[PDB]
């Protein structure tokens, strides 16, 4: 575990993380995809060997000794708000199990279901709150990656609020 487990946010490409493992915002079929998934594919392509996994699950594949946790959030275009919310919570619970199993002291994590899977809605608070519920019982240092300047401020404020 980390000696004083923390949350931090950085506005940068998760492919440049300084953590012991990365969470991919994966599609269910293990395809290269877009956004975070495309950046992960370019950096750790070997981790996409048998990475296909259902919605609401996470599957880890090693790129050398570096763990890539493929976490599949729901596409809110296809799910009801209610069933989507359930699957988004589930995906983050499976990430917490994998982080614990791997025994890493740190993890880079994006906000699941906030880009092309958002169904055209702002899901910063919904996704961030499911991340906290899952990860609060882990002792890994958690570094959340984002690309939008205004999202960086809101994620930073939400982390500070609880401390
Ligand atoms: Cl960058
Ligand atoms: Cl997404
Ligand atoms: Cl963002």
Curated annotation (Swiss-Prot):
Result when mutating residue 36 to A: Partial loss of mono-ADP-ribosylhydrolase activity
PTM? Phosphorylated by host on serines and threonines.
Macro domain: residues covered:
4-163
Q: Topology with regard to the membrane?
A: Peripheral membrane protein
Assembly mode: Interacts with mRNA-capping enzyme nsP1. Interacts (via C-terminus) with host G3BP1; this interaction inhibits the formation of host stress granules on viral mRNAs and the nsp3-G3BP1 complexes bind viral RNAs and probably orchestrate the assembly of viral replication complexes. Interacts (via C-terminus) with host G3BP2; this interaction inhibits the formation of host stress granules on viral mRNAs and the nsp3-G3BP2 complexes bind viral RNAs and probably orchestrate the assembly of viral replication complexes. Interacts (via C-terminus) with host NAP1L1.
Q: What does this protein do?
A: Seems to be essential for minus-strand RNAs and subgenomic 26S mRNAs synthesis. Displays mono-ADP-ribosylhydrolase activity. ADP-ribosylation is a post-translational modification that controls various processes of the host cell and the virus probably needs to revert it for optimal viral replication. Binds proteins of G3BP family and sequesters them into the viral RNA replication complexes thereby inhibiting the formation of host stress granules on viral mRNAs.
| Domain commentary | In the N-terminus, the macro domain displays a mono-ADP-ribosylhydrolase activity. The central part called, the alphavirus unique domain (AUD) has a zinc-binding function. The C-terminus region, also called hypervariable domain (HVD), is mainly disordered and binds several host proteins. This intrinsically disordered domain contains 2 SH3 domain-binding sites and 2 FGDF motifs necessary and sufficient for the formation of nsP3/G3BP complexes.
Q: What is this protein called?
A: Non-structural protein 3
Section of the entire sequence shown: 1334 to 1493 of 2474
